[PDB]
Every structure is written in C-alpha cells, then in structure tokens.
GROMACS .gro file of C-alpha atoms in nm:
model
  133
    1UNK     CA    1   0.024   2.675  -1.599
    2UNK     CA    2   0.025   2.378  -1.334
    3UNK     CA    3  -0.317   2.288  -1.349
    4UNK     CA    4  -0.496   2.033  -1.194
    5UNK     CA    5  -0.387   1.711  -1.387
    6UNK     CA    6  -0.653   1.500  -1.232
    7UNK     CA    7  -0.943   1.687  -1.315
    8UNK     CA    8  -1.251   1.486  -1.444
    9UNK     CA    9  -1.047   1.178  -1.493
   10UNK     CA   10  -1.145   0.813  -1.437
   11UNK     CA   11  -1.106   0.716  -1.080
   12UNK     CA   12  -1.080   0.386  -0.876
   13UNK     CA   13  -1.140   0.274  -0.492
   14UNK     CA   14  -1.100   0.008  -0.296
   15UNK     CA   15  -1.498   0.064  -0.204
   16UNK     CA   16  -1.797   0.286  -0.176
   17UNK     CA   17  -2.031   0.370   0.100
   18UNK     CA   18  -2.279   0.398  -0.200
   19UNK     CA   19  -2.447   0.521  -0.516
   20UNK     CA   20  -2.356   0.880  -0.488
   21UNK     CA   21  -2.024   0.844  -0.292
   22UNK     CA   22  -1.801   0.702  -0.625
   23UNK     CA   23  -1.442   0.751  -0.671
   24UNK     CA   24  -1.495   1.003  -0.949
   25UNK     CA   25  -1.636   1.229  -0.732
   26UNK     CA   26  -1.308   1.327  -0.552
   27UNK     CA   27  -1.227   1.438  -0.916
   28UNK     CA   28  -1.495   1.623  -0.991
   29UNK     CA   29  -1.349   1.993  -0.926
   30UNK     CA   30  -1.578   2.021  -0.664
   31UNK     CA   31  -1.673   2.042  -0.292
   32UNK     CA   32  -1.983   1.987  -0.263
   33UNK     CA   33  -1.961   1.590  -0.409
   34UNK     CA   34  -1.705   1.319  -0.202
   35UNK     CA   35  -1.555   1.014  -0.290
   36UNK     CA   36  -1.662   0.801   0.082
   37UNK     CA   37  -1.533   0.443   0.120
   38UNK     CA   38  -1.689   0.138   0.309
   39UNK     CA   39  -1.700   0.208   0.681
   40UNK     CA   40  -1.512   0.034   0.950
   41UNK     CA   41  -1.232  -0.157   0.740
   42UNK     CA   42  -0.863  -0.037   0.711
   43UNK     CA   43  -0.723  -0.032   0.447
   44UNK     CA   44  -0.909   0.165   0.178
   45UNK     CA   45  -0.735   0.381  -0.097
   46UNK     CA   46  -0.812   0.586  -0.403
   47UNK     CA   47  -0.619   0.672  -0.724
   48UNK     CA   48  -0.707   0.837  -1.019
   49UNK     CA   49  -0.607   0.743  -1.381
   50UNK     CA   50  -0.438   1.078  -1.554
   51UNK     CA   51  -0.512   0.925  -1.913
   52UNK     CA   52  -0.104   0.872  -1.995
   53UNK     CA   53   0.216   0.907  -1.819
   54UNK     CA   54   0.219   1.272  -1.696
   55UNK     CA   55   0.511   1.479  -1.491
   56UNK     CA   56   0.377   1.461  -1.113
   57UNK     CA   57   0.530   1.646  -0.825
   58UNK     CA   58   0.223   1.775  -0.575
   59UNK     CA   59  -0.122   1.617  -0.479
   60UNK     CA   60  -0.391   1.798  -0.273
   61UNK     CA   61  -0.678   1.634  -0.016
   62UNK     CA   62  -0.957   1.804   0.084
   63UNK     CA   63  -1.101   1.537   0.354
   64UNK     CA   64  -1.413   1.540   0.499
   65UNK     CA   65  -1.465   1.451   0.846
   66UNK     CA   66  -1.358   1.140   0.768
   67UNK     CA   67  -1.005   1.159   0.743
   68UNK     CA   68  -0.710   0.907   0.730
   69UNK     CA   69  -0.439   0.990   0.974
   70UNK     CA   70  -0.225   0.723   0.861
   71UNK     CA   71  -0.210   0.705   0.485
   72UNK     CA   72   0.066   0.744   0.193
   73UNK     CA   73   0.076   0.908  -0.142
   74UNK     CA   74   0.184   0.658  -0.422
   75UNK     CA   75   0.252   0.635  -0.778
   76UNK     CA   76   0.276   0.414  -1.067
   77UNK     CA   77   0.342   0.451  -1.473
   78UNK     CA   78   0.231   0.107  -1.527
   79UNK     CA   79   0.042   0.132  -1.860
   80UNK     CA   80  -0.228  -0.113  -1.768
   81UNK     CA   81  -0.409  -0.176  -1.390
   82UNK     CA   82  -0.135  -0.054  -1.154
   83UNK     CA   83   0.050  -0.296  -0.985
   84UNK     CA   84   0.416  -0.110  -0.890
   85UNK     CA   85   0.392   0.181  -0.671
   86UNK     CA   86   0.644   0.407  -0.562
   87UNK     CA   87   0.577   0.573  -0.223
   88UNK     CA   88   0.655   0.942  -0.234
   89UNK     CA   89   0.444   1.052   0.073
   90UNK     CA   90   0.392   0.913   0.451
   91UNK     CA   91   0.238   1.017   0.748
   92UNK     CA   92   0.107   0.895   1.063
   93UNK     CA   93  -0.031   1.242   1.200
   94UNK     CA   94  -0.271   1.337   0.960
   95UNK     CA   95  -0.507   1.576   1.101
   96UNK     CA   96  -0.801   1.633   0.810
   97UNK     CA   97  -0.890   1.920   0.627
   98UNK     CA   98  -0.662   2.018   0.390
   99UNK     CA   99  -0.314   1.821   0.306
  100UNK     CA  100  -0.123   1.930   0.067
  101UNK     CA  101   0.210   1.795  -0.012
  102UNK     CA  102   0.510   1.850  -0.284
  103UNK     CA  103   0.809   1.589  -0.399
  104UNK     CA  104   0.996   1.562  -0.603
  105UNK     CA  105   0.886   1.544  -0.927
  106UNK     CA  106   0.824   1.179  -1.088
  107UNK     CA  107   0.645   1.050  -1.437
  108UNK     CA  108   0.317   0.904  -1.365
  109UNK     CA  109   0.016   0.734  -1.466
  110UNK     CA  110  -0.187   0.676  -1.171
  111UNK     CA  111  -0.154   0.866  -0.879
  112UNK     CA  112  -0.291   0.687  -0.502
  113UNK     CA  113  -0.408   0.755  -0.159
  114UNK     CA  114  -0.358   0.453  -0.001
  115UNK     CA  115  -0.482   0.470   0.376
  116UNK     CA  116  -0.397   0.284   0.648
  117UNK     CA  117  -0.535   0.441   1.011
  118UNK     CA  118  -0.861   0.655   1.056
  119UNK     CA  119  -0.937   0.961   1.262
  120UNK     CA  120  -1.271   0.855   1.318
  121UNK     CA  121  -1.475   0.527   1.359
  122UNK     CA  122  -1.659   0.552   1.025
  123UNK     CA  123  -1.443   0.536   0.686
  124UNK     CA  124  -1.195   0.696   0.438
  125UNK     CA  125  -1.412   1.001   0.221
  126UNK     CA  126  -1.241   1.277   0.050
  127UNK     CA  127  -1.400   1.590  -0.161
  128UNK     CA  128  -1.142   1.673  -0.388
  129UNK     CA  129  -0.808   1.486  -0.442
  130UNK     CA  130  -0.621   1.731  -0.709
  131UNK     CA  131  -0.277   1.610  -0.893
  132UNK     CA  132  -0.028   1.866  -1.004
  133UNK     CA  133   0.323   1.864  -1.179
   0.00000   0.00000   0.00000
C-alpha cells in the first residue's frame, strides 16, 4: 500500500527550541504538533529511525513558517548511529509549505533532512516529515 514508513518512529535532531518542539513530533501523523530546532544557527537537521533497513524512494515536508531553503534529503543503512549518508535530494530554492520529492528507490535505515540556509531569521521547524517506498 505505500504507507507512511516513518510513522510514530523514533526521531533525532540536531536541537530543540524546547519541551514541546521534539523531533518525534514531525512523526507524529499530525499537523497540529512540529518538530522546531534552535533558532539562529545553520546547520540543523532531522532524521527519523524506520526500526530496520526499509525500501525508500519518496519523503514529504510539511514546513512551518520556518522553512529551510537550502537543505538536502539523505540516507543511511548503517545499523547503529548513522554516520554514511547518501545524498539523494538538493535544493537551494526551497520555498516552504509542502515539498515533496521522489528518487530513486534505495534501502534505508535512517532517513535525514539536513539543512543548510533558512527562509527566515528564526530556525529549522517542520510538522510532518513522512517517508515512503
């Protein structure tokens, strides 16, 4: 059925704004609830652990205002913390809202948004980050 592989899965930042604005809750299925990272400091990034080595080929962003416009989509099948990431995703002209992007299809692990610019002064902060294959 290509569901959402990411769904409710154990997620990791770089860092939170605060209690309430945790990685896990770009996983979460819902909109209402955001992953937000520290303010003012490039880089910050997100991935999500799918529990094993899953087949991978799409991810989805629902940003908030706070939206990277330069950031890449990454992945790794490391088993344990992930260390070697494959880029499969770049832009420089991100423009918020929605992104959603397809490749071509890989075996992953962990799947990452690694940002690099902002479009706005504050951080990085996405509502849902969805992984399909």
């Amino acid at each position: 059925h290509h569901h959402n592989l990411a769904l409710n899965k154990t997620a990791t930042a770089s860092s939170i704004e605060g209690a309430g604005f945790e990685a896990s809750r770009a996983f979460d299925g819902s909109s209402t609830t955001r992953w937000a990272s520290a303010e003012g400091v490039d880089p910050q990034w997100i991935y999500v652990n799918l529990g094993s080595s899953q087949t991978v080929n799409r991810v989805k962003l629902n940003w908030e205002a706070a939206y990277a416009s330069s950031y890449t989509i990454q992945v790794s099948n490391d088993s344990g913390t992930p260390t070697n990431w494959t880029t499969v995703y770049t832009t420089t002209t991100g423009d918020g809202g929605i992104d959603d992007i397809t490749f071509t299809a890989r075996t992953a692990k962990y799947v990452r948004m690694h940002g690099t610019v902002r479009g706005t002064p504050y951080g990085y902060s996405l509502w849902e980050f969805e992984v399909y294959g």
